[PDB]
Amino acid sequence: IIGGREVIPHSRPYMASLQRNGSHLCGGVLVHPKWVLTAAHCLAQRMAQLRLVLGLHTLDSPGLTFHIKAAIQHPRYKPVPALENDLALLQLDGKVKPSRTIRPLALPSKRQVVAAGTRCSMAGWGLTHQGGRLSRVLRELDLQVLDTRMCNNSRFWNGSLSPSMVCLAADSKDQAPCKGDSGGPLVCGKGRVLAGVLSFSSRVCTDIFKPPVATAVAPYVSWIRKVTGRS
């Protein structure tokens, strides 16, 4: 995150770090004692060398590490240059017993609407400057939901955002999620309810004409329930 704030440690106990050879790649949200939800584009990788690390504040700290039993990309996932259905479920090779530092975040109702003007936040260990390095510590950024139609304007996303995407704005031009933040959760409202999963970050993170986007979780809740086996 560029222009974000360090979080109070373990204040977001649902946070996952998806890592390859001990190097953080993407964020994730623990949504079941056995499952992390992340972006599908995060799994363009040699799966064997991937790990999920839970309970982190500082990245150079051990946390609780899991191997991945299964990596289930949304059946209709399409990659860049036609990014769609950008969600994947990763099954831990263990089972989380909730504690102070590690606890799943509840799925929203499948009827949940993420309306324009909604106040949300995201968290992640992604880059803190363009072309920079990952954050050593988990950071957060406030984001408000924008009107999708306005985000689809020819000067912005040029009609490419579907009803399943959440278009977002930080409070200033120089604050943005950045490489390493994608796959992490978007939480909204006073209730800090799970609302989306950050999709691909723009290469130029603060590109004013590419408002950051997250996939809405609600339209995928039935699929998440079918995969996790929890109705």
Curated annotation (Swiss-Prot):
InterPro entries in UniProt: Peptidase_S1_PA, Peptidase_S1_PA_chymotrypsin, Peptidase_S1A, Trypsin_dom, TRYPSIN_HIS, TRYPSIN_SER
Residues that carry a glycan: 152
Tissue specificity statement from the Swiss-Prot or TrEMBL entry: Highly and constitutively expressed in activated natural killer (NK) cells.
Predominant place of localization: secreted
Domain named Peptidase S1: residues: 1-229
GO molecular function: serine-type endopeptidase activity; serine-type peptidase activity
Keyword Disulfide bond on entry: yes
Single GO biological process annotation from the record: T cell mediated cytotoxicity
One GO location term (cellular component): extracellular space
Magnesium among keywords: no
UniProtKB keywords: Apoptosis, Cytolysis, Disulfide bond, Glycoprotein, Hydrolase, Immunity, Innate immunity, Protease, Secreted, Serine protease, Signal, Zymogen
Disulfide bonds: 26-42, 120-188, 151-167, 178-205
Enzyme Commission number, as recorded: 3.4.21.-
Superkingdom field: Eukaryota
Subcellular location, record wording: Secreted; Cytoplasmic granule
Family of the protein in this entry: Belongs to the peptidase S1 family. Granzyme subfamily.
Function according to Swiss-Prot or TrEMBL: Cleaves peptide substrates after methionine, leucine, and norleucine. Physiological substrates include EZR, alpha-tubulins and the apoptosis inhibitor BIRC5/Survivin. Promotes caspase activation and subsequent apoptosis of target cells.
Protein name (database record): Granzyme M
